[PDB]
Design a protein around this ligand. Structure first.
Ligand SMILES: *[C@@H]1O[C@H](CO)[C@@H](O[C@@H]2O[C@H](CO)[C@@H](O)[C@H](O)[C@H]2NC(C)=O)[C@H](O)[C@H]1NC(C)=O
Ligand SMILES: *[C@@H]1O[C@H](CO)[C@@H](O)[C@H](O)[C@H]1NC(C)=O
Ligand SMILES: *[C@@H]1O[C@H](CO)[C@@H](O)[C@H](O)[C@H]1NC(C)=O
Ligand SMILES: *[C@@H]1O[C@H](CO)[C@@H](O)[C@H](O)[C@H]1NC(C)=O
Ligand SMILES: *[C@@H]1O[C@H](CO)[C@@H](O)[C@H](O)[C@H]1NC(C)=O
Ligand SMILES: *[C@@H]1O[C@H](CO)[C@@H](O)[C@H](O)[C@H]1NC(C)=O
Ligand SMILES: *[C@@H]1O[C@H](CO)[C@@H](O)[C@H](O)[C@H]1NC(C)=O
Lengths: 225, 300, 47, 50, 50, 50
């Protein structure tokens, strides 16, 4: 539907503790002020959108009922796909992987998908703002999250810790959601200057290609010019 | 002559050595891939993962002599130290003249269309001569390889499509008017020469850059000395220094820490999960102050 | 009346300039904090 | 700052950390990776001194 | 003129043109030949700046 | 296996060259004269070693 405007999607890029440093690193990030697509069409039917994956995605739900819980990724989104069904009362729980032949997408109800056989892998793991901000990239889908309690964005800065890194190994050309106020964006290769605190946390960042100033800040490795 | 000369450097030597590997599970699931009764075709090579296990590589030397054993980024006999942080293992059967193609940067019908290693590849390619088990007098046609594809493969991708490929210009359906099946069987026979005989290839793929690890370490651990210049080995990270109690607020996420110049300055103990700081052992230049040979042999 | 017997102007001149190298017995700093980076902090062989 | 930061560079080696090269590889390969690091370190020091 | 002239030197490489090295050789050898050209050209810039 | 840097039952337990070895390794096929139909049992290898 509409497009929004925010500076979100920063996460800890590695497992190394750093403090009181300015660290210049290159990874895939949601660029600052990049166009982000914002999303009751189903009512009692489905008619859900199907999106591209491109290189990787950022997705952040702020829904009291967690209507969107799972996702399907795959080359074509046909009968041989990666149905990453994740139904969670908790932050992340009940992950499933690899193909299923049929999907579940009944007022105030949720049906399970029914398949004839699992002919490929199976993996499991069990665990007002409730922003399930996360990232999806790489041979392992590294899902990050941060919960900072209305449901409108404060438009502040917050970094995401990793939650899970289950193995995947699949093409992931396309992406679609699984349903029982959402923000979806796309990642691009970017270099960021990340500001670390005295503690092991990131407090700010500069997107080194957004504009001439940010580029200068990255060249000098400083937030003051 | 009279004066002050800088002649050498003092170093404080360690007095003890420590090894702090994680709790050993005694699981060594390597015979499952090496000693399997059936191996996958190269066009659809098999993949497994090893995690929460301890490796001991003498078992594969007990398993069999090998045709080839080539490691990149690591050498044999060093695999009994921390050897992996993320473990995969690929398994396939290939032709002898193509064994040289399972290596970084190589080209050919397997490197291009069936299985490719990245140019920046760390791991070991182990090839065993399997004629006794894979060859049949009529030919073993269970093994297929891809001979036609539209483009070259990328590292570790698995193309299992069977869609008909056309080499000609007129878009055809079915087989035989320049439309060809993308896979071809190879009938392995006991009478083929060394280059045409079947070989079973197992590729152990891993990265040694990540801080945590859930695999490797047949080595016995010791007790954790603190506040004393020691040598240490923490999950494959080795060095000399003084270990101290840390007050750094590490996240449960983070395993190692680094200082202002991106060198390690802290570790998470693999058995206790306590954060320890690493301070290098004291050192510095040494200068000799002498009145000179023609005055006195006393020095400071 | 001031230690080091500097003039008021000398005192200002010394206070204005920031010295990053800070030569002294660097072992006094020891650890207990994030490394200062003063620029090898001795440990990499630069003193 | 530049002279110290150059220690983290690889100069074509598999790793910028000398202990990792010695741990992972046996002498005949370690000598090549070490020679690559030595060449880079001499270039850094000679530039600094100049 | 000396810096521009140095771009035509091989510095021990099979070819002075990076595209010829990448086209004619496999990546493994190409990285070595490129490292030789990089070493020579970097030395040329360091000499110029000095 | 009779070469610097190699591993195996002979390189490990019977005959290992220095990794900086210089000299020539010369080998030839002796089957015509050395082998016997009953078996030539004058040759053996250590085959294990602590
Ligand atoms: C890092 O986290 C610690 C808590 O683990 C913070 O400690 C607080 O420090 C302030 C100022 O000294 C005290 O008033 C608080 O009471 C401390 N909290 C606790 C729980 O002891 C520390 O400030 C954090 N650092 C940063 C930069 O945010
Ligand atoms: C971007 O535009 C939207 C329009 O609604 C606004 O709400 C948002 O605050 C803007 N972002 C910035 C950083 O100005
Ligand atoms: C495992 O290896 C041993 C080696 O002696 C062999 O006898 C056994 O048959 C192998 N396992 C299978 C399932 O073939
Ligand atoms: C492939 O690997 C899986 C790992 O779980 C194993 O179960 C399977 O039997 C293997 N198949 C072949 C043909 O090696
Ligand atoms: C992955 O999907 C893309 C579709 O964009 C396709 O071009 C590519 O060949 C696929 N690769 C494999 C290994 O399936
Ligand atoms: C390892 O085992 C010891 C047994 O006393 C236990 O206390 C410790 O927490 C264990 N550590 C891990 C990481 O499992
Ligand atoms: C040397 O160490 C002692 C430890 O008690 C300390 O009191 C003293 O001030 C130190 N001196 C210097 C110059 O570091």
């Amino acid at each position: 539907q509409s497009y929004t405007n925010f500076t979100r999607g920063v996460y800890y890029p590695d497992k190394v503790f750093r403090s009181s440093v300015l660290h210049l690193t290159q990874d895939l990030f949601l660029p600052f002020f990049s166009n982000v697509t914002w999303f009751t069409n189903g009512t009692k039917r489905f008619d859900n959108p199907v999106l591209p994956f491109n290189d990787g995605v950022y997705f952040a739900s702020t829904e009291k009922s967690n209507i969107i819980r799972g996702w399907i990724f795959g080359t074509t989104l046909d009968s041989k796909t990666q149905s990453l069904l994740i139904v969670n009362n908790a932050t992340n729980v009940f992950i499933k992987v690899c193909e299923f032949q049929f999907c579940n997408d009944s007022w105030m109800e949720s049906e399970s998908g029914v398949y004839s056989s699992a002919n490929n892998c199976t993996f499991e793991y069990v665990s007002n703002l409730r922003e399930f901000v996360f990232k999806n990239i790489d041979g392992y889908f590294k899902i990050y999250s941060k919960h900072t309690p209305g449901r409108d964005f404060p438009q502040g800065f917050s970094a995401l810790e990793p939650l899970v890194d289950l193995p995947i190994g699949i093409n992931i050309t396309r992406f679609q959601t699984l349903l029982a106020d959402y923000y979806v964006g796309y990642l691009q290769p970017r270099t960021f200057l990340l500001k670390y605190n005295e503690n092991g946390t990131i407090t700010d960042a500069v997107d080194c290609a957004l504009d001439p100033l940010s580029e200068t800040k990255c060249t000098l490795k400083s937030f003051t010019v | 002559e009279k004066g002050i000369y800088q002649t050498s450097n003092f170093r404080v030597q360690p007095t003890e050595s420590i090894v702090r590997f994680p709790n050993v599970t005694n699981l060594c699931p390597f015979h499952e891939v090496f000693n399997a009764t059936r191996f996958a075709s190269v066009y659809a090579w098999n993949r497994t993962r090893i995690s929460n296990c301890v490796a001991d590589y003498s078992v594969l030397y007990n398993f069999a002599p090998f045709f080839a054993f080539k490691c990149y980024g690591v050498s044999p006999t060093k695999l009994n130290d921390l050897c992996f942080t993320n473990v995969y293992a690929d398994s396939f059967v290939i032709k002898g003249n193509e064994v040289s193609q399972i290596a970084p940067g190589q080209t050919g019908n397997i490197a291009d269309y069936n299985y490719k290693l990245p140019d920046d590849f760390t791991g070991c390619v182990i090839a065993w001569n399997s004629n006794k088990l894979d060859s049949k007098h009529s030919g073993n046609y269970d093994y297929w390889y891809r001979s036609f594809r539209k483009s070259k493969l990328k590292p570790f991708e698995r193309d299992i499509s069977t869609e008909i490929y056309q080499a000609g210009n007129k878009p055809c359906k079915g087989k035989g008017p320049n439309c060809y099946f993308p896979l071809e069987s190879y009938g392995f026979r006991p009478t083929y020469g060394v280059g045409h005989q079947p070989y079973r290839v197992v590729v152990l793929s891993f990265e040694l850059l990540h801080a945590p690890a859930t695999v490797c370490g047949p080595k016995k651990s010791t007790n954790l000395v603190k506040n004393k210049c020691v040598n240490f080995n923490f999950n494959g990270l080795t060095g000399t220094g003084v270990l101290t109690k840390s007050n750094k607020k590490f996240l449960p996420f983070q395993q190692f820490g680094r200082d202002i110049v991106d060198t390690t300055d802290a570790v998470r103990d693999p058995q206790t999960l306590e954060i320890l700081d690493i301070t290098p052992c004291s050192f510095g230049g040494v200068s000799v102050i002498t009145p000179g040979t023609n005055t006195s042999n006393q020095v400071a | 009346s001031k230690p080091s017997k500097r003039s008021p102007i000398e005192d200002l001149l010394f206070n204005k300039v920031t010295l990053a190298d800070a030569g002294f017995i660097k072992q006094y700093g020891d650890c207990l904090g994030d490394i200062a980076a003063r620029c090898a902090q001795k440990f990499n062989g630069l003193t | 700052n530049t002279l110290v930061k150059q220690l983290s560079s690889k100069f074509g080696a598999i790793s910028s950390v000398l202990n990792d090269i010695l741990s992972r590889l046996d002498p005949p390969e370690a000598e090549v990776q070490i020679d690559r690091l030595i060449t880079g370190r001499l270039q850094s020091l000679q530039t600094y001194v100049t």
